[PDB]
Every structure is written in structure tokens, then in C-alpha cells.
Amino acid sequence: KFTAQQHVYDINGVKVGGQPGEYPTVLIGSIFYRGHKIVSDGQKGIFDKDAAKALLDQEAELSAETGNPFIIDVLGESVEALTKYVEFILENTTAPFLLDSISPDVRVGALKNLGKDPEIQKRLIYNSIEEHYTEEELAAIKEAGLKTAVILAFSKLKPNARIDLLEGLIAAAKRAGIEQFLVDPGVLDVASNSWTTEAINVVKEQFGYPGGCAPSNAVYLWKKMRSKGTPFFEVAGAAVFTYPITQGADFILYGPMMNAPWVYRAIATTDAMIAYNNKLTGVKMGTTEHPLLKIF
Amino acid sequence: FKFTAQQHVYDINGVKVGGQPGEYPTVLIGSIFYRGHKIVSDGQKGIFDKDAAKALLDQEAELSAETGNPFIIDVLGESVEALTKYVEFILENTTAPFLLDSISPDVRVGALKNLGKDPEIQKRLIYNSIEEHYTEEELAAIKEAGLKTAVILAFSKKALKPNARIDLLQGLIAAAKRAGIEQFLVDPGVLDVASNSWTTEAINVVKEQFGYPGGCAPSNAVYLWKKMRSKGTPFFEVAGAAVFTYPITQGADFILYGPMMNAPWVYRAIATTDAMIAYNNKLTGVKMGTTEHPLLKIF
Ligand SMILES: CN1c2c(O)nc(N)nc2NC[C@@H]1CNc1ccc(C(=O)N[C@@H](CCC(=O)O)C(=O)O)cc1
Ligand SMILES: CN1c2c(O)nc(N)nc2NC[C@@H]1CNc1ccc(C(=O)N[C@@H](CCC(=O)O)C(=O)O)cc1
């Protein structure tokens, strides 16, 4: 149980945040990532629409099974590609999504192209407000009327240098008109997932913002474990992805959506055990759509 | 160094168990000759496929060498004859310490008599377990054999809540000490998959207050979880990995992971959790007690 009153956000019906055991973990799957084989052209955003739709439908089916809500991590390396990717996601799921590029120019460029349909405001989450945020990003976010952003509380390493960042990143996000802050302290490698999780606990303990991370960042490149094949890679992946949840995290970017079938079953199990602690902490489940009431 | 109490680290025939989080790798305890282990043709006389049994022990040694997770064998028996034969086989076919494991105190004492005095028994045999309703005969049998390590099942129908379970110790530790036990592996018990969170909280209380190595059998309900197991591979294994790694994330020292056939996936999951926990040591100042650790092996 965290000292700070925990912020629970409703993003187009997706609840995220609260005391551990209050709400299920929100699972965030990546689509059109670098080397996503359904993409034939990452510059023009040419991709297999049948394959993309099949991933979105699988996500909805797994979400319905476990009670873990989903937000799509929509990656793009160009304004043209990310715009087409988001247009596809808008039409083919109801889920909220991350507008995700490592380039702030791609993110702002895509935002301008996507326009001012109120569906953008309701579903689009800015990924992310980072250490080197620009006044232009803040102004573009405000002009778009976005209310949720990922805050990437990461620099160049200890949890303390990550909190130092929160003018802070929260103050900057507030200037952009952001009211809902999804705090991501960043993940540098597999081993230091423990450092990230430490930063997550400070965020929830001190501020009560939802806290999460991308434990996916180095796991898929861990060839020594991945080369062992199934189910050895998947249980190692499960250990890494569930670790932040055991330390009270609210959301996980689990990497490529093709991994959803094993990720959801692992994360749902951790959620169920943590919610059983509610009986000792006095925490009330915020929803009956929870792994504890679904997976047994 | 999250626990207040100085943590006991035990050396059981070279297997280190205990410490502060990230100091030592998780000790993994696989079950052999469990009820409906299909390598047993006769559970009453203890007739088993010795080649299949040796293959499991050899696989355990290989996985242990790969990750650095040490191993103790959970030797289950339903009769004095069977458990005697199982322990005689384990003694000759591995160096690993082992749990003398029956739910019947009469079977545990019976097997102890059959095995009798042997410096190997005093070195490697761990009594599984000293329980709420222990008998004076058990304590006298344990002292006669000269055992120095026992599992303490800190569980009662009357003590479901974490604080209540550990209240049994002081008590169960006194009973063990009367039997000449010097090393206590505290197991608060696992009733179901969901209440592993309760078991893990009980492990935290033991380590916080007493500093005894704390562990459990998250295996107890996992293999009977039909809804998840019916999904098959790798869905059952990642769900089982979530259950088995959970106590370790909260500072537990050893896991009874169930049937040894599961060791290939269990070792890879637990080694990963151990590696991440040990990387925290750069911030707490805990010194890894050994270089034979997942953090230095799995990457
Ligand atoms: C960088 N990381 C991240 C983060 O840490 N925080 C936020 N908010 N957003 C993001 N977005 C992107 C990323 C999370 N998503 C990921 C992370 C990693 C991969 C990945 O490893 N892909 C593989 C190829 C796919 C594969 O091997 O299966 C690669 O080698 O690049 C794919 C997607
Ligand atoms: C009860 N539990 C336990 C415990 O909680 N604490 C201690 N110290 N020792 C023990 N020893 C026995 C047990 C831990 N080991 C286990 C737990 C469960 C199983 C198990 O579910 N076996 C089943 C399923 C076999 C299978 O489906 O693979 C069987 O039919 O035998 C097999 C072994």
C-alpha cells in the first residue's frame, strides 16, 4: 500500500492506476516496430492490413479472457508512416493508443496530419514527454487538446536522477494541458528492470501517478535465452515482464503484439495473486473484470 | 538489505541457502516419486524406472551448472519401504541434499530407522517437516539420526494470516532445537495459487523478525489449475513461472517447484528473477555471496 492517494485514469474506458490489487495491469503491445515483418515499407507505412487487424482482434480476445485492458503502442519512423498507422488503428479498434516515435519531429508532424476529430483527443496518448522536450511539442500537444501523455522520467541512471526529472517533466506536461500522467522511468537492459521498478515505487509512493515501463526493451535481443526457443524464452520473458507488477506497477509495454498470447496469461496470474493481498491491505477491487475473478 | 534481522545463510553439503535479497541464488527443490509420478510402477514397494530417475537427477545437475541455482531434491514416499528405496537411490546417484518427504510422520520416522546412522544422512538429509502436530517420537528419531537441518512448516488451520503463521515458531523452532536441528528452513505453506501472496508475506515476516531462510511450495495448487493447464505450452509454463517467481520477488530463499520434469522451464524463469534482484545490490550495497549466480551466467 502506497502513502500517496493514487490517481486512477479512464482513457476511453481503460482504467489505469490505483493501489496494487485495485485495477488489473494495462498491457501495451507494439505494432509497426522496427523489423515488424508485416511492414513492407516503413517510410511510406505500407503493411499487411489483414495481419494488423488479426493482431488487434487477438488483443481484444485476450483482454476479454483475463480482464487486462489494452492500449496499442503504435510505432513509426516517419510522419507519413505513423499517420497511416494511426488512421488504421483508429478505424480497426476502439482501444486508446500511444503515438510513438523516438523523433519528436515525427510525433508533432503526425499530430498535425491526424487533424482535430474529437476521437484523437479521446484515444491518442503522447509517447512521450522526455528529458529534452521542446516548447513546440508542448504547444502541439496543447493545440491537439490531448489530456494523457507518457512521461519518460529517464536521463543519462539511478532511480534518484529519474525522480529529479519529474522545470520538471510534470510541470511541462501541465503547461501542454496534460491532466493524466503515465510515468515511465525507462528500461536500459534486462538486469536493471529492478532499477526501473524502484523508480516506479517512488512515483506511486510520493506522487500517486500511474507507473509502468517497457521491460520489452532488451528482452527480444537477449539471444542467449531466445536461442533456447519455446517455452524457455517465454518463461524468462514472463519473469522480466511480471517483475515490475510485483513491485506495484500499473502498465507494461510488453513489445511485439505477436507475444500477447503468453504475456496476458503470465501478467493475469501476477495480478490475481496481488489482488488476493487486498484481504490483508483492505484495498477494494475497482472492477469485477479482474484476473482473480476470471482465470480460476 | 531490506530485512532488519541478520539473515542466517546455511551450508547444506555445499548448498548455500538464505541471506538478504540478491546475496545468494534461489535454491530450487524439485519433486520425485510424487503421487502419480509415472516413473513409479509401485508406490507401495517403491518400484521405479531407475534410468528415468537418474535422467531427472542428471538434468537437475546440468540446469544448476547452467544458471548457478543450487538444488535440493524433494524425495516423496507414501510408505516406509518406498521412501527408504527412494532415499537409498538419491544417496548414490547425486550429491544434492534432499527432503525426506511424507505427509505421514510414521512414514518419515520409519524411513529414518531403515536409513539409520550414516555420516551421509547427517550431511544431506533434511527433515520435511516439523509441523504444528509434531510427535515426541519424531524429535527423538531426528536426534538419534543426528540431523542438523529441518523444514519448519509454519502453518496451521488456526493461523491463515501471515503474522499468525510465524507466531507458531516461538514453539516449532524450540521443538526442532530439542531434536538437535541447528538449521531451520521456514515454509509458511501454500494452500492455493491466489494466496501465494499471503505465503510470501509470511516469508517476509520470518526473514524480518528471525532471519531464517524462507521458502514455500507454490507447486501445491499450480499443477491442479485445470483452466490454465488446459491451454497447454507455453501458456501453462508462463503462468507457472509467474507463480513460482512471485515469492522470490518479495525476498524468498527457496522454492519447491513441483515435478522435476518442469525443471527446464523453472530454472530459466527463476534465474531471470534472481539476476534482476541481484542487480538491485548496486543500490543496497549487498555483496553477492558467490560468483556462481544467474546475474553472471544467463546473459
Ligand atoms: C523504447 N521502448 C519504449 C519505452 O521504453 N517506453 C515507452 N514509453 N515507449 C517505448 N516504445 C518502444 C519501446 C517498447 N517497445 C518495443 C521494445 C522492443 C522491441 C524489440 O525488441 N523489437 C525487436 C524486433 C522484434 C523481435 O525481435 O521480435 C528489435 O530487435 O528491435 C519492440 C518494441
Ligand atoms: C505439499 N507440498 C509441500 C509443501 O507445501 N511444503 C513442503 N515442505 N513440502 C511439500 N512437499 C510436497 C508438496 C510440494 N511438491 C509437490 C506439489 C504438487 C505436486 C503435484 O501437484 N503433483 C500432481 C500433479 C502431477 C502433474 O500433473 O505433473 C500429482 O498428481 O502428483 C507435486 C509435488
XYZ file of C-alpha atoms and ligand atoms in Angstrom:
661
model
C 0.000 0.000 0.000
C 1.414 3.413 -1.166
C 1.181 6.581 1.037
C 0.111 8.953 -1.809
C -3.574 8.983 -2.886
C -3.304 7.026 -6.201
C -4.590 8.655 -9.454
C -6.919 6.315 -11.450
C -7.402 7.499 -15.085
C -10.215 6.487 -17.503
C -8.704 6.643 -21.071
C -11.638 5.884 -23.470
C -12.896 3.289 -20.897
C -9.412 1.880 -19.952
C -8.825 2.249 -16.163
C -5.096 2.589 -15.225
C -3.573 3.272 -11.763
C -4.687 2.834 -8.126
C -3.259 0.834 -5.184
C -1.850 -2.610 -6.144
C -4.822 -5.051 -6.391
C -7.286 -2.188 -7.213
C -7.191 -2.490 -11.079
C -5.697 -5.100 -13.455
C -2.381 -4.298 -15.233
C -2.955 -2.451 -18.579
C -0.998 -4.333 -21.321
C 0.561 -2.274 -24.176
C 1.560 -4.235 -27.325
C 3.835 -2.745 -30.039
C 2.788 -2.723 -33.745
C 4.875 -1.463 -36.765
C 8.089 -1.589 -34.602
C 11.465 -1.659 -36.480
C 11.610 -5.033 -38.311
C 7.874 -5.812 -37.854
C 7.657 -8.276 -40.792
C 4.024 -7.185 -41.680
C 5.581 -3.798 -42.797
C 6.924 -3.853 -46.429
C 7.812 -0.079 -46.354
C 8.466 1.705 -43.000
C 8.962 5.108 -44.772
C 5.565 5.112 -46.633
C 3.803 2.925 -43.977
C 2.870 0.063 -46.387
C 1.799 -3.028 -44.333
C -0.307 -6.247 -44.318
C -3.740 -4.885 -43.170
C -5.164 -8.453 -42.680
C -2.182 -9.314 -40.359
C -2.507 -5.946 -38.493
C -6.312 -6.468 -37.975
C -5.673 -10.094 -36.769
C -3.263 -8.735 -34.066
C -5.890 -6.142 -32.913
C -8.668 -8.823 -32.772
C -6.378 -11.256 -30.813
C -5.608 -8.416 -28.317
C -9.376 -7.796 -27.740
C -9.988 -11.607 -27.302
C -7.126 -11.988 -24.728
C -8.266 -8.763 -22.898
C -11.845 -10.212 -22.691
C -10.410 -13.541 -21.319
C -8.192 -12.140 -18.462
C -9.728 -8.669 -17.706
C -6.370 -6.933 -18.511
C -7.274 -3.794 -20.559
C -5.087 -2.904 -23.608
C -3.574 0.238 -25.193
C -1.790 -0.177 -28.596
C 1.827 1.102 -28.872
C 1.778 2.500 -32.484
C 5.429 2.949 -33.646
C 6.546 4.913 -36.765
C 9.931 6.226 -38.039
C 8.346 8.830 -40.433
C 5.383 11.304 -40.361
C 3.833 9.558 -43.447
C 4.083 6.020 -41.902
C 2.922 6.933 -38.331
C -0.062 8.951 -39.757
C -1.262 5.923 -41.868
C -0.630 3.503 -38.920
C -2.730 5.679 -36.522
C -5.522 6.087 -39.163
C -5.634 2.230 -39.398
C -5.719 1.802 -35.536
C -8.498 4.476 -35.216
C -10.782 2.557 -37.680
C -9.880 -1.065 -36.640
C -10.005 -0.971 -32.761
C -11.702 1.175 -30.046
C -8.562 0.972 -27.805
C -6.582 4.079 -26.839
C -3.075 4.099 -28.403
C 0.421 5.586 -27.870
C 1.586 7.999 -30.608
C 5.131 6.551 -30.501
C 8.268 7.730 -32.373
C 11.794 8.321 -30.905
C 11.750 11.538 -33.077
C 9.788 14.468 -31.523
C 9.549 15.892 -35.126
C 7.794 12.665 -36.331
C 5.366 12.781 -33.314
C 4.461 16.509 -33.814
C 4.348 16.016 -37.650
C 1.961 13.021 -37.277
C -0.208 15.043 -34.778
C -0.670 17.850 -37.403
C -1.543 15.291 -40.184
C -4.107 13.442 -37.950
C -6.226 16.641 -37.509
C -8.839 17.624 -34.882
C -11.560 14.879 -34.954
C -12.589 14.580 -31.244
C -11.677 10.808 -31.457
C -7.949 11.893 -31.480
C -8.366 13.753 -28.109
C -10.239 10.731 -26.596
C -7.829 7.920 -27.681
C -4.346 9.378 -28.527
C -1.673 9.290 -25.734
C 1.568 11.289 -26.409
C 4.610 8.932 -26.112
C 6.455 10.737 -24.711
C 7.313 13.956 -22.806
C 11.082 13.296 -22.378
C 14.149 14.964 -20.725
C 14.788 17.170 -23.847
C 11.088 18.077 -24.525
C 10.671 21.225 -26.721
C 8.242 24.186 -26.313
C 6.958 23.135 -29.807
C 5.948 19.630 -28.503
C 4.151 21.261 -25.515
C 2.386 23.762 -27.881
C 1.479 20.972 -30.419
C 0.062 18.737 -27.594
C -1.996 21.733 -26.284
C -3.245 22.661 -29.832
C -4.327 18.966 -30.301
C -6.186 19.051 -26.902
C -4.528 15.790 -25.681
C -5.272 15.019 -21.962
C -2.945 11.952 -21.442
C 0.846 11.665 -22.047
C 3.528 9.104 -21.138
C 6.200 10.952 -19.069
C 9.595 9.313 -19.784
C 11.413 10.102 -16.483
C 14.796 8.871 -17.844
C 18.260 10.550 -18.321
C 21.996 9.624 -18.728
C 20.726 6.352 -14.364
C 19.945 5.711 -10.631
C 16.254 5.952 -9.596
C 17.046 9.367 -7.896
C 18.169 11.015 -11.231
C 14.850 9.718 -12.751
C 12.694 11.359 -9.963
C 14.782 14.609 -10.202
C 13.380 14.859 -13.806
C 9.660 14.734 -12.676
C 11.290 22.803 -14.520
C 10.221 19.118 -14.163
C 8.514 16.909 -16.817
C 5.147 17.022 -14.874
C 5.195 20.886 -14.795
C 5.976 20.879 -18.586
C 3.182 18.309 -19.297
C 0.779 20.549 -17.253
C 1.798 23.567 -19.476
C 0.791 21.410 -22.538
C -2.667 20.897 -20.886
C -1.936 17.227 -19.911
C -4.078 16.206 -16.851
C -3.247 12.418 -16.848
C 0.457 11.418 -16.446
C 1.569 7.811 -17.214
C 5.096 7.775 -15.680
C 7.702 5.544 -17.431
C 11.180 5.673 -15.767
C 12.631 3.797 -18.825
C 14.339 0.349 -19.140
C 18.031 0.199 -20.226
C 18.580 -3.612 -20.163
C 17.092 -6.822 -18.632
C 19.151 -6.811 -15.363
C 18.303 -3.127 -14.483
C 14.490 -3.756 -14.752
C 14.958 -3.766 -10.907
C 16.236 -0.085 -11.071
C 13.181 0.922 -13.211
C 10.807 -0.857 -10.740
C 12.492 1.071 -7.846
C 11.725 4.396 -9.690
C 8.087 3.176 -10.217
C 7.668 2.634 -6.398
C 8.909 6.217 -5.623
C 6.424 7.654 -8.217
C 3.421 5.782 -6.670
C 4.664 6.297 -3.029
C 5.330 10.090 -3.421
C 3.008 11.304 -6.286
C 0.441 8.508 -6.955
C 0.728 8.838 -10.787
C 0.313 5.509 -12.609
C 3.794 3.967 -13.057
C 4.931 1.497 -15.733
C 7.744 0.637 -18.170
C 8.807 -1.276 -21.316
C 10.559 -4.387 -19.883
C 10.386 -5.441 -23.603
C 13.332 -3.067 -24.416
C 16.258 -5.609 -24.181
C 14.380 -8.987 -23.771
C 13.797 -9.700 -27.524
C 17.574 -9.000 -28.173
C 18.624 -11.478 -25.368
C 19.815 -14.102 -27.937
C 21.458 -16.388 -25.274
C 17.935 -17.017 -23.807
C 15.863 -16.525 -27.032
C 18.020 -19.141 -28.922
C 16.782 -21.794 -26.370
C 13.313 -21.480 -28.054
C 9.871 -22.304 -26.521
C 8.868 -22.330 -23.719
C 12.242 -21.202 -22.208
C 12.301 -17.733 -23.873
C 8.607 -17.129 -22.906
C 9.082 -18.033 -19.154
C 12.247 -15.822 -18.992
C 10.182 -13.059 -20.716
C 7.339 -13.719 -18.198
C 9.816 -13.319 -15.245
C 11.031 -9.923 -16.654
C 7.529 -8.588 -17.626
C 5.832 -9.620 -14.299
C 8.715 -8.236 -12.095
C 7.519 -4.561 -12.247
C 3.895 -5.691 -11.456
C 5.181 -7.495 -8.263
C 6.661 -4.074 -7.222
C 3.254 -2.343 -7.822
C 3.475 -1.091 -11.479
C 0.180 -0.260 -13.331
C 1.101 -0.845 -17.045
C 3.672 -2.798 -19.153
C 4.856 -2.234 -22.768
C 5.445 -5.969 -23.448
C 6.893 -5.472 -27.006
C 5.595 -7.011 -30.289
C 1.830 -7.854 -30.127
C 2.560 -11.406 -31.521
C 3.686 -12.215 -27.888
C 0.225 -11.230 -26.430
C -0.967 -14.873 -26.004
C 1.758 -15.790 -23.414
C 2.183 -12.234 -21.930
C -1.554 -11.938 -20.944
C -1.559 -15.378 -19.191
C 1.638 -14.527 -17.182
C 0.540 -10.963 -16.193
C -3.070 -12.055 -15.345
C -1.561 -14.637 -12.869
C 0.583 -11.994 -11.083
C -2.471 -9.615 -10.958
C -4.589 -12.424 -9.347
C -2.010 -13.107 -6.543
C -1.531 -9.333 -5.820
C -5.359 -8.779 -5.621
C -5.594 -11.642 -3.033
C -3.441 -9.346 -0.770
C -6.486 -6.923 -0.829
C -7.848 -9.134 2.039
C -4.800 -8.005 4.181
C -4.428 -4.351 2.876
C -8.204 -3.502 2.891
C -7.919 -2.384 -0.811
C -11.257 -2.800 -2.708
C -11.072 -4.131 -6.313
C -12.226 -1.191 -8.530
C -13.759 -3.643 -11.093
C -15.130 -7.264 -11.098
C -13.460 -7.537 -14.592
C -10.217 -8.675 -12.844
C -7.947 -11.733 -13.400
C -8.632 -13.016 -9.798
C -12.373 -13.493 -10.697
C -11.713 -14.801 -14.284
C -8.613 -17.111 -14.525
C -9.539 -19.837 -11.885
C 19.442 -5.153 2.869
C 15.667 -4.746 3.298
C 15.363 -7.174 6.328
C 16.161 -5.911 9.877
C 17.320 -9.294 11.336
C 20.821 -10.577 10.431
C 19.992 -13.270 7.805
C 21.160 -16.865 8.523
C 22.988 -18.345 5.477
C 23.231 -22.178 5.840
C 25.740 -24.511 4.099
C 23.937 -27.868 3.452
C 26.589 -30.175 1.860
C 27.870 -27.098 -0.098
C 24.357 -25.725 -0.999
C 24.092 -22.113 0.380
C 20.507 -21.003 1.303
C 19.308 -17.697 2.857
C 20.762 -14.157 3.072
C 19.421 -10.675 2.167
C 17.661 -10.306 -1.237
C 20.196 -10.807 -4.107
C 23.014 -12.180 -1.828
C 22.528 -15.872 -2.916
C 20.690 -17.512 -5.845
C 17.280 -19.169 -5.213
C 17.640 -22.859 -4.174
C 15.297 -24.919 -6.417
C 13.667 -28.054 -4.954
C 12.132 -30.466 -7.480
C 9.794 -33.349 -6.500
C 10.486 -37.013 -7.464
C 8.220 -40.058 -6.709
C 5.227 -37.713 -6.039
C 1.776 -39.419 -6.166
C 1.200 -40.241 -9.884
C 4.851 -39.769 -10.921
C 4.557 -42.139 -13.945
C 8.198 -43.447 -13.498
C 6.871 -45.263 -10.335
C 5.244 -48.653 -11.232
C 4.629 -49.486 -7.499
C 4.365 -46.599 -4.954
C 3.887 -49.068 -2.018
C 7.088 -51.159 -2.639
C 8.956 -48.214 -4.315
C 9.485 -49.859 -7.762
C 10.548 -47.162 -10.283
C 12.346 -46.655 -13.641
C 15.918 -46.064 -12.274
C 17.174 -44.795 -15.714
C 14.290 -42.216 -15.833
C 15.060 -41.227 -12.171
C 18.833 -40.872 -12.951
C 17.999 -38.786 -16.103
C 15.953 -36.334 -13.902
C 18.857 -36.023 -11.361
C 21.395 -35.510 -14.232
C 19.108 -32.858 -15.883
C 18.894 -31.055 -12.474
C 22.748 -31.040 -12.163
C 23.066 -29.679 -15.770
C 20.444 -26.878 -15.264
C 22.063 -25.988 -11.879
C 25.524 -25.736 -13.593
C 23.955 -23.554 -16.378
C 22.149 -20.924 -14.160
C 24.022 -21.232 -10.802
C 20.735 -22.054 -8.954
C 21.703 -24.777 -6.416
C 19.318 -27.756 -5.993
C 17.865 -29.911 -3.180
C 15.729 -32.985 -4.165
C 12.184 -33.357 -2.691
C 12.001 -37.186 -2.159
C 8.279 -38.132 -1.705
C 7.089 -41.535 -0.370
C 3.670 -42.958 0.696
C 5.223 -45.970 2.575
C 8.328 -46.717 4.725
C 9.500 -49.320 2.132
C 9.124 -46.903 -0.868
C 10.660 -43.794 0.827
C 13.592 -45.979 2.084
C 14.285 -47.250 -1.504
C 13.886 -43.698 -2.980
C 16.372 -42.180 -0.433
C 18.897 -45.082 -0.933
C 18.788 -44.291 -4.725
C 19.153 -40.459 -4.211
C 22.152 -41.022 -1.816
C 24.123 -42.958 -4.542
C 23.046 -41.008 -7.706
C 23.563 -37.309 -6.685
C 25.478 -35.219 -4.059
C 22.406 -32.942 -3.597
C 20.895 -32.584 -0.117
C 17.291 -33.905 -0.094
C 13.966 -33.592 1.761
C 12.770 -36.785 3.481
C 9.151 -36.049 2.468
C 5.934 -37.842 3.552
C 2.668 -36.349 4.909
C 2.789 -39.238 7.487
C 5.151 -38.750 10.477
C 5.052 -42.604 10.854
C 6.451 -42.982 7.254
C 9.155 -40.290 7.882
C 10.289 -41.962 11.196
C 10.030 -45.477 9.631
C 12.324 -44.486 6.695
C 14.765 -42.755 9.149
C 15.116 -46.125 11.032
C 15.728 -48.059 7.734
C 18.379 -45.468 6.614
C 19.699 -45.330 10.222
C 23.150 -43.884 11.024
C 25.394 -42.961 8.049
C 27.518 -39.762 8.062
C 25.967 -39.130 4.559
C 22.428 -38.948 6.169
C 23.527 -36.354 8.833
C 25.142 -34.291 5.988
C 22.401 -34.375 3.274
C 19.011 -35.476 4.775
C 16.658 -32.547 5.602
C 13.561 -33.472 7.700
C 10.367 -32.425 5.819
C 8.903 -31.384 8.084
C 8.472 -30.295 11.740
C 4.747 -29.335 11.761
C 2.200 -27.961 14.301
C 1.218 -31.529 15.438
C 4.834 -32.899 15.647
C 5.271 -36.001 17.907
C 7.963 -36.517 20.622
C 8.865 -39.714 18.629
C 9.733 -37.535 15.544
C 12.036 -35.293 17.660
C 13.740 -38.361 19.283
C 14.129 -40.111 15.851
C 15.635 -36.876 14.338
C 18.121 -36.576 17.288
C 19.023 -40.345 17.050
C 19.898 -39.880 13.292
C 21.876 -36.679 14.172
C 20.089 -34.490 11.548
C 21.135 -30.784 11.591
C 18.645 -29.281 9.024
C 14.795 -29.432 9.027
C 11.961 -27.695 7.145
C 9.627 -25.993 9.667
C 6.069 -25.938 8.260
C 4.915 -22.655 9.904
C 1.245 -23.381 9.021
C -1.969 -24.194 10.969
C -5.746 -24.353 10.222
C -5.715 -21.798 13.145
C -3.069 -19.472 11.516
C -4.015 -18.422 7.912
C -2.922 -14.746 8.326
C 0.839 -14.107 7.831
C 1.565 -12.760 11.401
C -0.323 -15.785 12.931
C 1.691 -18.403 10.903
C 5.080 -17.065 12.170
C 3.639 -16.911 15.764
C 3.880 -20.799 15.628
C 7.751 -20.539 15.536
C 8.198 -19.276 19.179
C 7.150 -23.257 19.611
C 8.207 -25.081 16.391
C 11.863 -23.786 16.475
C 12.142 -24.929 20.171
C 10.805 -28.414 19.110
C 13.422 -28.584 16.257
C 16.246 -27.469 18.653
C 15.214 -30.263 21.130
C 15.717 -32.681 18.145
C 19.280 -31.214 17.699
C 18.365 -29.236 14.494
C 20.744 -26.209 14.046
C 19.479 -25.004 10.587
C 15.770 -24.067 10.048
C 14.188 -23.701 6.553
C 10.845 -21.956 7.283
C 7.914 -22.893 4.961
C 4.682 -20.970 5.810
C 2.703 -23.326 3.461
C 0.796 -22.734 0.164
C -2.985 -23.505 0.112
C -3.883 -22.202 -3.416
C -2.433 -20.146 -6.348
C -4.022 -16.756 -5.337
C -2.978 -16.967 -1.611
C 0.742 -17.329 -2.590
C 0.703 -13.545 -1.816
C -0.222 -14.496 1.826
C 2.534 -17.202 1.936
C 5.072 -14.643 0.578
C 4.020 -12.038 3.233
C 4.623 -14.768 5.903
C 8.139 -15.369 4.375
C 8.822 -11.581 4.699
C 7.727 -11.676 8.422
C 10.091 -14.666 9.175
C 13.113 -13.013 7.463
C 12.311 -9.576 9.043
C 11.953 -10.958 12.643
C 14.104 -14.182 12.826
C 16.343 -14.084 9.688
C 15.772 -17.836 8.930
C 15.761 -18.774 5.219
C 12.119 -18.600 3.994
C 10.524 -20.516 1.100
C 7.391 -22.400 0.012
C 5.837 -24.862 -2.453
C 3.989 -22.624 -4.977
C 3.702 -26.016 -6.819
C 0.906 -27.136 -4.388
C -2.103 -25.853 -6.453
C -0.419 -24.859 -9.812
C -0.436 -28.361 -11.449
C -4.165 -28.869 -10.487
C -5.080 -25.464 -12.109
C -7.117 -27.069 -14.969
C -8.334 -23.782 -16.626
C -4.717 -22.604 -17.258
C -3.056 -26.052 -17.708
C -5.643 -26.973 -20.447
C -4.243 -24.054 -22.604
C -1.010 -26.129 -22.995
C 2.529 -24.848 -23.838
C 3.800 -22.210 -23.385
C 0.728 -20.689 -21.602
C 0.750 -23.038 -18.554
C 4.557 -22.605 -18.139
C 4.464 -18.723 -18.199
C 1.524 -18.782 -15.694
C 3.510 -21.269 -13.522
C 6.628 -19.056 -13.932
C 4.584 -16.036 -12.617
C 3.510 -18.103 -9.527
C 7.000 -19.603 -8.831
C 8.953 -16.296 -9.283
C 6.437 -14.272 -7.130
C 7.844 -15.277 -3.675
C 11.440 -14.633 -4.974
C 10.476 -11.007 -5.984
C 9.473 -10.483 -2.291
C 12.746 -11.959 -0.869
C 12.149 -15.777 -0.581
C 15.239 -18.098 -0.495
C 13.968 -21.467 -1.888
C 11.048 -22.808 -3.991
C 9.540 -26.312 -4.148
C 8.597 -26.066 -7.883
C 6.830 -29.491 -8.124
C 7.667 -32.363 -10.510
C 11.358 -32.360 -11.661
C 10.189 -32.732 -15.335
C 9.325 -28.962 -15.052
C 12.986 -28.042 -14.135
C 13.993 -26.955 -17.698
C 11.453 -24.050 -17.740
C 11.506 -23.343 -13.919
C 15.357 -22.816 -13.843
C 15.230 -20.342 -16.790
C 12.354 -18.325 -15.153
C 13.849 -18.251 -11.582
C 17.423 -17.493 -12.839
C 15.961 -14.412 -14.674
C 14.218 -13.155 -11.470
C 17.432 -13.806 -9.408
C 19.508 -11.814 -11.985
C 17.220 -8.717 -11.739
C 17.087 -8.893 -7.863
C 20.942 -9.131 -7.647
C 21.281 -6.015 -9.937
C 19.486 -4.084 -7.098
C 22.660 -4.861 -4.969
C 24.408 -1.895 -6.757
C 21.958 0.366 -4.759
C 21.570 -1.506 -1.359
C 25.290 -2.455 -1.092
C 24.557 -6.210 -0.561
C 27.626 -8.240 -1.651
C 26.787 -11.319 -3.820
C 27.840 -14.226 -1.525
C 29.020 -16.255 -4.594
C 30.127 -15.580 -8.234
C 28.088 -18.759 -9.123
C 24.962 -16.576 -9.657
C 22.437 -16.211 -12.549
C 23.414 -12.488 -12.966
C 26.964 -13.576 -14.072
C 25.820 -16.623 -16.174
C 22.491 -16.113 -18.099
C 23.494 -13.019 -20.243
C 11.735 2.026 -26.193
N 10.504 1.353 -25.729
C 9.663 2.230 -25.109
C 9.890 2.607 -23.779
O 10.837 2.206 -23.093
N 8.978 3.493 -23.212
C 7.895 3.996 -23.945
N 7.039 4.844 -23.387
N 7.713 3.618 -25.220
C 8.566 2.752 -25.801
N 8.322 2.386 -27.101
C 9.237 1.485 -27.857
C 9.897 0.572 -26.858
C 8.895 -0.512 -26.382
N 8.523 -1.451 -27.482
C 9.363 -2.321 -28.069
C 10.583 -2.677 -27.492
C 11.437 -3.577 -28.117
C 11.092 -4.165 -29.340
C 12.008 -5.068 -29.932
O 12.946 -5.523 -29.275
N 11.874 -5.362 -31.243
C 12.848 -6.270 -31.888
C 12.319 -6.877 -33.200
C 11.088 -7.718 -32.893
C 11.532 -9.099 -32.440
O 12.754 -9.348 -32.339
O 10.623 -9.926 -32.217
C 14.138 -5.496 -32.209
O 15.185 -6.167 -32.303
O 14.051 -4.260 -32.374
C 9.860 -3.812 -29.916
C 9.004 -2.905 -29.288
C 2.717 -30.204 -0.069
N 3.926 -29.700 -0.754
C 4.893 -29.355 0.136
C 4.828 -28.134 0.824
O 3.924 -27.303 0.712
N 5.868 -27.875 1.702
C 6.908 -28.789 1.882
N 7.901 -28.528 2.708
N 6.947 -29.940 1.211
C 5.960 -30.233 0.356
N 6.073 -31.440 -0.296
C 5.051 -31.875 -1.278
C 4.392 -30.637 -1.837
C 5.343 -29.949 -2.844
N 5.520 -30.748 -4.085
C 4.558 -31.032 -4.955
C 3.387 -30.295 -5.072
C 2.420 -30.653 -6.008
C 2.608 -31.736 -6.860
C 1.568 -32.049 -7.748
O 0.659 -31.243 -7.970
N 1.533 -33.305 -8.231
C 0.378 -33.776 -9.015
C 0.420 -33.356 -10.492
C 1.484 -34.131 -11.239
C 1.424 -33.463 -12.588
O 0.290 -33.141 -13.007
O 2.500 -33.262 -13.181
C 0.296 -35.293 -8.810
O -0.638 -35.903 -9.365
O 1.138 -35.791 -8.032
C 3.786 -32.478 -6.725
C 4.756 -32.121 -5.790
